[PDB]
Amino acid sequence: TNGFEVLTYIPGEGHNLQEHSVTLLRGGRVKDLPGVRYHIVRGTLDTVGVEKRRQQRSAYGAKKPK
């Protein structure tokens, strides 16, 4: 929303990003890629959740299997 351009890693297996989309970034710092210091919170807005996940779901954003 500001005027700063940051390279942000998509934390998960599979993405719905289509070059033009909206994401809700959070804090972090992946050690493998130099320069990346942010993470996209998964399953909040336009970005979809991470299905096919039953472990540590609260972080990736997947509806409780129930």
Binding stretches for Mg ion (CB under 5 A): 56
Rg of the Cα atoms in the chain = 13
User: In sequence order, what are the residues at sequence separation of 6 or more whose Cβ sits closer than 8 angstroms to the Cβ of residue 36?
Assistant: 7, 8, 9, 29, 30
Nearer to Mg ion, 8 or 11 (CB): 11
Closest CA to 21 of 48, 2, 39: 48
- Residue 20 interaction partner, one of Mg ion, RNA, none, beta carbon < 5-8 Å per kind: none
- Residue 11 interaction partner, one of RNA, Mg ion, none, beta carbon < 5-8 Å per kind: RNA
Residues 22-51 that bind RNA (CB under 7 A): 24, 26-32, 41, 43-44, 49
Note the residues at the interface with RNA (CB under 7 A): 1, 11-14, 24, 26-32, 41, 43-44, 49, 52-64, 66
